[PDB]
Amino acid sequence: HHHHHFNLPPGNYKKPKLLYCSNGGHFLRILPDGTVDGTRDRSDQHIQLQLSAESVGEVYIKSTETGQYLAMDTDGLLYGSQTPNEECLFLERLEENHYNTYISKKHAEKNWFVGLKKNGSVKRGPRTHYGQKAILFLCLPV
């Protein structure tokens, strides 16, 4: 049983990508200390990510620089995990036909997305929802 639709973006896990949030034009970054936030500096060595498919529609977002896994905790907070756990899986879905959205699999029913606010700060799960511009990402080439 699904809580969401199954419109998926075509395969793009071959090479490393940059998760660009159109909302404020920031790049998703996972700092060495496990901190996650946004930055417009495309030359930043920590915005380069590598997605991997676990199950059709399920992905892992990993830092090529530090090797950390993007993850969302029970309070809806994003962080960088040293090991893959059930909080690192995201349902990568197509939104508005051409954007990408990443839903916490663990909290899929509550509709918790990966989102960046216009000031580049990470948005909290419960504060995200369909229809926002913070949940709309685009995988750009490194």
UniProtKB/Swiss-Prot annotation:
Phenotypic consequence of residue 121 to E: Decrease in LRRC59-binding
Tell me what the record says results from residue 124 to E: Reduced integrin-binding. Defective in integrin-, heparin- and FGFR1-binding, and defective in inducing FGF1 signaling, cell proliferation and cell migration
How does the record describe the protein's post-translational processing?
In the nucleus, phosphorylated by PKC/PRKCD.
Annotated spans, Heparin-binding: 117-133
- A Pfam cross-reference name: FGF
Q: What stretch of residues is annotated with the motif Nuclear localization signal?
A: 14-17
Q: Subcellular localization, per the record?
A: Secreted; Cytoplasm; Cytoplasm, Cell cortex; Cytoplasm, Cytosol
Protein name as it appears in the record: Fibroblast growth factor 1
Q: Which GO terms describe its molecular function?
A: fibroblast growth factor receptor binding; growth factor activity; heparin binding; integrin binding; S100 protein binding
The membrane-spanning stretches of this chain are none
The processes (GO biological process) annotated in the record are: activation of protein kinase B activity; anatomical structure morphogenesis; angiogenesis; branch elongation involved in ureteric bud branching; cellular response to heat; epithelial cell proliferation; fibroblast growth factor receptor signaling pathway; lung development
Q: Known InterPro entries for this protein?
A: Fibroblast_GF_fam, IL1/FGF
The effect annotated for residue 99 to A is: No effect on integrin- and heparin-binding, loss of FGFR1-binding, defective in inducing FGF1 signaling, cell proliferation and cell migration
Query: What's the subunit arrangement here?
Result: Monomer. Homodimer. Interacts with FGFR1, FGFR2, FGFR3 and FGFR4. Affinity between fibroblast growth factors (FGFs) and their receptors is increased by heparan sulfate glycosaminoglycans that function as coreceptors. Found in a complex with FGFBP1, FGF1 and FGF2. Interacts with FGFBP1. Part of a Cu(2+)-dependent multiprotein aggregate containing FGF1, S100A13 and SYT1. Interacts with SYT1. Interacts with S100A13. Interacts with LRRC59. Interacts with CSNKA, CSNKB and FIBP. While binding with LRRC59, CSNKA and FIBP seem mutually exclusive, CSNKB and FIBP may cooperatively interact with FGF1.
Effect in UniProt of substituting residue 123 to R? No effect on LRRC59-binding
The record's function comment reads: Plays an important role in the regulation of cell survival, cell division, angiogenesis, cell differentiation and cell migration. Functions as a potent mitogen in vitro. Acts as a ligand for FGFR1 and integrins. Binds to FGFR1 in the presence of heparin leading to FGFR1 dimerization and activation via sequential autophosphorylation on tyrosine residues which act as docking sites for interacting proteins, leading to the activation of several signaling cascades. Binds to integrin ITGAV:ITGB3.
Query: Main localization of the protein?
Result: secreted
